[model samples]
Target: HMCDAFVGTWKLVSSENFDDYMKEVGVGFATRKVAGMAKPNMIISVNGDVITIKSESTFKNTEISFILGQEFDEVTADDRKVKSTITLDGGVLVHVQKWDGKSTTIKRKREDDKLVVECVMKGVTSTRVYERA
Candidate 1:
């Protein structure tokens, strides 16, 4: 199988039960509301061990980058970012994001015509699924 098939651009189309996911991640009520309503444009670029993703919306824009199988730092929300690292868990790409004392893992896959992204924090998980535009 080609793991690099996921290395491309994808845009948000729709989701299921994403509010709960954001809530679990400690996002504010207003922010969660906006996130639920906004269909952000997401672009992911992967080259060897380095990858970068840009998630943009009218309310806010977030970008993250990391080296595969290595430890690196990441920033989020264009400013109030966090320190994070991304690694490969078997065939899955996983990110361990840290800010202060909080941490989260982001996993993703492209199956069929959709790109599924899941964020896990404190045992609770939320996923955002997207399709090609």
Candidate 2:
């Protein structure tokens, strides 16, 4: 049901604490500055057990395709390769990625008319809100 709600393009609206979170994740200052200035667009598609998320921005563009509950290798926006798994839990999309003994958790859920994405790494958390485009 929640997957049904996530089947469209979404535009970034506002980001909270993203720079701090990126810094905690070891992102360089200049790269973090560029990332802070980037307004990325996400296009999500869910077909049966497969899910695809395409992130497009002026700085970079990347696409990730995964199956629910199945672990796969993913290269993140920052070019870090990690093992990731995505699962649907209580109408929310939960993703967990682990690399170099560090783990990151991301949760995506529909909130009112917006899609809210929360990313947590170490103890730092960043929230990004998106509107359907």
Candidate 3:
């Protein structure tokens, strides 16, 4: 499965338009500053059909576990309670979250030596690149 490609620890190396993306996601000013300054590690693992991702940073740490095509409850970094689902779409990992009719999508794709993350909320889009840890 493509999941195996992400079964390792990764360190964030680059980010683009992150602050604007957080604003679009409805994060407060204080939390958005924290989110902008802190770089994080993305660790992914799989057991059977379940996939787990742990995002660790000096500012805050969070985790999520879910199976492909299954819905689950998710709490965002800015403390928003949302419903999330992750599925493989055209070889890319697509994660969609819905909350109070607000929607956002995060897509992950392995590109040679890097794991690329794209976060989209409304018209704003952010991109972060992670490399091997």
Candidate 4:
């Protein structure tokens, strides 16, 4: 049931400290401004051992498909190419990405009627809240 909890489309509700986190991740100022103003929505699907995450927005739309614990190449929203892996721990899904001698981790968990995503890079962390649509 825990895995099924993430199978839905979620709309962005609010975000905290995302700008700083984007800056730390090497996002350009113009792109960061656009990103700050965009309200991206996420669609998550889980099929047996495969997981798919699609981020939709006016600025950019992208999809990532992967299996648990399997590493694959990924290009983030900010356009940083990296190797990424997703692992499930209890009800939380943790994503780790490494590139250019840098690493970023994002954790997603369902809380009440919302999905909470926490992104950490270097020492900066950002929190984003999303609600099922």
Q: Pick the candidate with the highest TM-score.
A: 3
Ranking by TM-score: 3, 2, 4, 1
- Tell me the TM-score of each prediction against the true structure: 0.82, 0.96, 0.97, 0.96
Better of 3 and 4 by lDDT: 3
lDDT of 1 by residue, 30-100 (tens): 87787688888778887665677888788678777666666666656523367776776666677777787
The predictions' CA RMSDs to the true structure, in order, are: 2.4, 1.0, 0.8, 1.0
lDDT of 3: 0.93
Per-residue lDDT over 24-112 for candidate 4, one digit per residue giving the tens place of the 0 to 100 score: 98889999999988888999998878889999998889899999899998988878899999999986999999999989899999999
lDDT per model, in order? 0.73, 0.92, 0.93, 0.92
lDDT value for model 1 = 0.73
lDDT value for candidate 4?
Answer: 0.92
Per-residue lDDT over 4-60 for candidate 2, one digit per residue giving the tens place of the 0 to 100 score = 898899999999999999988888988899889989999999877789999999978
Worst 10 residues of 4 by lDDT: 1-10
The reply for model 1, stretches above 4 Å from the true place, is: 1-3, 78-80
Candidate 3 weakest lDDT stretch, 10 residues: 1-10
lDDT of 2: 0.92
What does the lDDT read for residue 59 in candidate 2? 79
lDDT, candidate 3, 22-114, per-residue tens: 989888899998889988999999988999999999888999999999999998888999999999988899999999899999999999999
Pairs of colliding residues, candidate 3: none
Scanning candidate 1 in windows of ten residues, the lowest lDDT window is 72-81
Pairs that collide, model 2: none
